[PDB]
Coordinates of all heavy atoms in Angstrom, one line a residue:
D1 N -29.9 32.7 68.4 CA -29.3 33.6 67.3 C -28.1 32.9 66.7 O -27.9 33.0 65.5 CB -29.0 35.0 67.9 CG -30.1 35.9 68.1 OD1 -31.2 35.7 67.6 OD2 -29.9 36.9 68.9
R2 N -27.2 32.3 67.5 CA -26.0 31.6 67.1 C -26.4 30.4 66.1 O -25.8 30.3 65.1 CB -25.2 30.9 68.2 CG -24.5 31.9 69.2 CD -24.3 31.2 70.5 NE -23.5 32.0 71.4 CZ -22.2 32.2 71.3 NH1 -21.5 31.6 70.4 NH2 -21.6 33.0 72.2
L3 N -27.4 29.6 66.6 CA -27.7 28.4 65.9 C -28.4 28.8 64.5 O -28.0 28.2 63.5 CB -28.7 27.5 66.7 CG -29.1 26.2 66.1 CD1 -27.9 25.4 65.8 CD2 -30.0 25.5 67.1
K4 N -29.3 29.8 64.5 CA -29.9 30.3 63.3 C -28.7 30.8 62.4 O -28.7 30.4 61.2 CB -31.0 31.3 63.5 CG -31.9 31.5 62.3 CD -32.7 32.7 62.4 CE -33.0 33.3 61.0 NZ -34.3 33.9 60.9
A5 N -27.8 31.6 62.9 CA -26.7 32.2 62.0 C -25.9 31.0 61.4 O -25.6 31.1 60.2 CB -25.8 33.1 62.8
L6 N -25.5 30.0 62.1 CA -24.8 28.8 61.7 C -25.6 28.1 60.5 O -25.0 27.7 59.5 CB -24.7 27.8 62.9 CG -24.0 26.5 62.6 CD1 -22.5 26.7 62.2 CD2 -24.1 25.5 63.7
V7 N -26.9 27.9 60.7 CA -27.7 27.1 59.8 C -28.0 27.9 58.5 O -27.8 27.4 57.4 CB -29.0 26.5 60.4 CG1 -29.9 25.7 59.4 CG2 -28.6 25.6 61.6
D8 N -28.4 29.2 58.7 CA -28.5 30.2 57.6 C -27.2 30.2 56.7 O -27.3 30.1 55.5 CB -28.9 31.6 58.1 CG -30.3 31.7 58.6 OD1 -31.1 30.7 58.5 OD2 -30.7 32.8 59.1
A9 N -26.1 30.4 57.3 CA -24.8 30.5 56.6 C -24.5 29.2 55.8 O -24.0 29.3 54.7 CB -23.7 30.8 57.6
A10 N -24.9 28.1 56.4 CA -24.7 26.8 55.7 C -25.7 26.6 54.5 O -25.3 26.1 53.4 CB -24.8 25.6 56.7
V11 N -26.9 27.0 54.7 CA -28.1 26.7 53.8 C -28.2 27.8 52.7 O -28.3 27.4 51.5 CB -29.4 26.5 54.6 CG1 -30.6 26.5 53.6 CG2 -29.4 25.3 55.5
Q12 N -28.3 29.0 53.1 CA -28.7 30.1 52.2 C -27.8 30.1 50.9 O -28.3 30.0 49.8 CB -28.8 31.4 53.0 CG -30.1 31.4 53.7 CD -30.3 32.6 54.6 OE1 -29.3 33.1 55.1 NE2 -31.5 32.9 55.0
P13 N -26.5 30.2 51.0 CA -25.6 30.2 49.8 C -25.9 29.0 48.9 O -25.9 29.1 47.7 CB -24.2 30.1 50.3 CG -24.3 30.6 51.7 CD -25.7 30.3 52.2
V14 N -26.2 27.8 49.4 CA -26.3 26.6 48.7 C -27.7 26.5 48.0 O -27.8 26.1 46.8 CB -26.0 25.4 49.6 CG1 -26.1 24.0 48.8 CG2 -24.6 25.5 50.2
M15 N -28.7 27.0 48.7 CA -30.0 27.1 48.1 C -29.9 28.1 46.9 O -30.5 27.7 45.8 CB -31.0 27.7 49.1 CG -31.6 26.7 50.0 SD -33.0 27.4 51.0 CE -34.3 27.4 49.8
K16 N -29.2 29.2 47.1 CA -29.0 30.2 46.0 C -28.3 29.5 44.8 O -29.0 29.5 43.8 CB -28.3 31.4 46.6 CG -28.2 32.6 45.6 CD -29.4 32.8 44.8 CE -29.5 34.1 44.1 NZ -30.1 35.2 45.0
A17 N -27.1 29.0 45.1 CA -26.3 28.5 44.0 C -26.9 27.3 43.3 O -26.5 27.0 42.2 CB -24.9 28.2 44.5
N18 N -27.8 26.5 43.9 CA -28.4 25.3 43.3 C -29.8 25.6 42.9 O -30.5 24.7 42.5 CB -28.3 24.1 44.2 CG -26.8 23.7 44.4 OD1 -26.2 23.0 43.7 ND2 -26.3 24.2 45.5
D19 N -30.3 26.8 43.0 CA -31.7 27.3 42.7 C -32.7 26.3 43.3 O -33.6 25.8 42.7 CB -31.7 27.3 41.1 CG -33.0 27.9 40.6 OD1 -33.5 28.9 41.2 OD2 -33.4 27.5 39.4
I20 N -32.6 26.0 44.6 CA -33.5 25.2 45.4 C -34.7 26.0 45.8 O -34.5 27.0 46.6 CB -32.8 24.5 46.6 CG1 -31.6 23.7 46.2 CG2 -33.8 23.8 47.4 CD1 -30.6 23.4 47.4
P21 N -35.9 25.7 45.4 CA -37.0 26.5 45.9 C -37.3 26.4 47.4 O -37.6 27.4 48.0 CB -38.2 25.9 45.1 CG -37.6 25.2 43.9 CD -36.2 24.7 44.4
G22 N -37.3 25.2 47.9 CA -37.7 24.9 49.3 C -36.7 23.9 49.9 O -36.2 23.0 49.3
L23 N -36.4 24.1 51.2 CA -35.5 23.3 52.0 C -35.9 23.3 53.4 O -36.2 24.4 53.9 CB -34.1 23.7 51.7 CG -33.0 22.9 52.3 CD1 -31.7 22.9 51.4 CD2 -32.6 23.3 53.7
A24 N -36.0 22.1 54.0 CA -36.3 21.9 55.5 C -35.1 21.3 56.2 O -34.6 20.3 55.7 CB -37.5 21.0 55.6
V25 N -34.6 22.0 57.2 CA -33.6 21.4 58.1 C -34.2 21.1 59.5 O -35.1 21.8 59.9 CB -32.4 22.4 58.3 CG1 -31.4 21.9 59.3 CG2 -31.8 22.8 57.0
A26 N -33.9 19.9 60.0 CA -34.3 19.4 61.3 C -33.0 18.9 62.0 O -32.2 18.2 61.3 CB -35.3 18.3 61.3
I27 N -32.7 19.4 63.2 CA -31.5 19.1 64.0 C -31.9 18.5 65.3 O -32.8 19.1 66.0 CB -30.6 20.3 64.1 CG1 -30.1 20.8 62.8 CG2 -29.4 19.9 65.1 CD1 -29.8 22.3 62.8
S28 N -31.3 17.4 65.7 CA -31.4 16.9 67.1 C -30.1 17.2 67.8 O -29.0 16.7 67.3 CB -31.7 15.4 67.1 OG -31.9 14.9 68.4
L29 N -30.1 18.0 68.8 CA -28.9 18.5 69.6 C -29.2 18.1 71.1 O -30.1 18.6 71.6 CB -28.8 20.0 69.4 CG -27.4 20.6 69.3 CD1 -27.4 22.1 69.8 CD2 -26.4 19.9 70.2
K30 N -28.4 17.2 71.6 CA -28.5 16.7 73.0 C -30.0 16.6 73.4 O -30.4 17.1 74.4 CB -27.7 17.7 73.9 CG -26.2 17.5 73.9 CD -25.7 16.1 74.3 CE -24.2 16.0 74.4 NZ -23.5 15.9 73.1
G31 N -30.8 15.9 72.6 CA -32.2 15.5 72.9 C -33.2 16.6 72.6 O -34.4 16.4 72.9
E32 N -32.8 17.7 72.1 CA -33.7 18.9 71.7 C -33.8 19.0 70.2 O -32.8 19.1 69.5 CB -33.1 20.2 72.3 CG -33.1 20.3 73.8 CD -34.4 20.7 74.3 OE1 -34.9 21.8 73.9 OE2 -35.0 20.0 75.2
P33 N -35.0 19.1 69.7 CA -35.2 19.3 68.2 C -35.2 20.8 67.9 O -35.7 21.7 68.6 CB -36.6 18.7 67.9 CG -37.4 18.9 69.2 CD -36.3 18.8 70.3
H34 N -34.6 21.1 66.7 CA -34.6 22.5 66.1 C -34.9 22.4 64.7 O -34.3 21.6 63.9 CB -33.2 23.1 66.3 CG -32.7 23.1 67.8 ND1 -33.1 24.1 68.6 CD2 -31.9 22.2 68.4 CE1 -32.5 23.9 69.8 NE2 -31.8 22.7 69.7
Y35 N -35.8 23.3 64.2 CA -36.3 23.3 62.8 C -35.9 24.6 62.2 O -36.1 25.7 62.8 CB -37.8 23.0 62.7 CG -38.2 21.7 63.5 CD1 -38.8 21.8 64.7 CD2 -37.8 20.5 63.0 CE1 -39.2 20.6 65.3 CE2 -38.1 19.3 63.6 CZ -38.9 19.4 64.8 OH -39.2 18.3 65.5
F36 N -35.4 24.6 60.9 CA -35.2 25.7 60.1 C -35.8 25.4 58.7 O -35.4 24.4 58.1 CB -33.7 26.0 60.0 CG -33.1 26.3 61.4 CD1 -32.7 25.2 62.2 CD2 -33.0 27.6 61.9 CE1 -32.2 25.4 63.5 CE2 -32.5 27.8 63.2 CZ -32.1 26.7 63.9
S37 N -36.8 26.2 58.3 CA -37.5 26.0 57.0 C -37.2 27.2 56.1 O -37.3 28.3 56.7 CB -39.0 25.9 57.3 OG -39.3 24.9 58.3
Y38 N -37.0 27.0 54.9 CA -36.6 28.0 53.9 C -37.5 27.9 52.6 O -37.7 26.8 52.1 CB -35.1 27.8 53.5 CG -34.1 27.9 54.6 CD1 -33.8 26.8 55.4 CD2 -33.6 29.1 55.0 CE1 -33.0 26.9 56.5 CE2 -32.7 29.2 56.0 CZ -32.4 28.1 56.8 OH -31.6 28.2 57.9
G39 N -37.9 29.0 52.1 CA -38.5 29.1 50.8 C -39.7 28.3 50.6 O -40.5 28.1 51.6
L40 N -40.0 27.8 49.4 CA -41.3 27.4 48.9 C -41.4 25.9 48.7 O -40.5 25.4 48.0 CB -41.7 28.3 47.7 CG -41.7 29.8 48.0 CD1 -42.1 30.5 46.7 CD2 -42.8 30.1 49.0
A41 N -42.5 25.3 49.2 CA -42.9 23.9 48.9 C -43.4 23.9 47.5 O -43.2 22.9 46.7 CB -43.9 23.5 49.9
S42 N -44.1 24.9 47.1 CA -44.6 25.1 45.7 C -44.4 26.6 45.3 O -44.9 27.5 46.0 CB -46.1 24.7 45.6 OG -46.6 25.2 44.3

């Protein structure tokens, strides 16, 4: 819940303000991958 809130707060406003249809985040944190996918590829 913390990590999603952090990544949402960083991404969502900027996707909005730059009219970005789709955005993929991938994070490597102490050897563990985490994915956050937003909006539309098409």
Side-chain angles (χ1 to χ4, degrees):
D1 287 338
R2 292 159 175 281
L3 182 58
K4 196 197 149 147
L6 179 68
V7 177
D8 289 357
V11 167
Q12 281 173 335
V14 179
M15 276 188 79
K16 187 39 167 270
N18 297 274
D19 190 34
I20 301 165
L23 186 149
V25 178
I27 299 155
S28 183
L29 215 206
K30 284 300 188 283
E32 290 279 307
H34 306 274
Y35 308 107
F36 302 86
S37 309
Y38 301 86
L40 297 181
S42 166

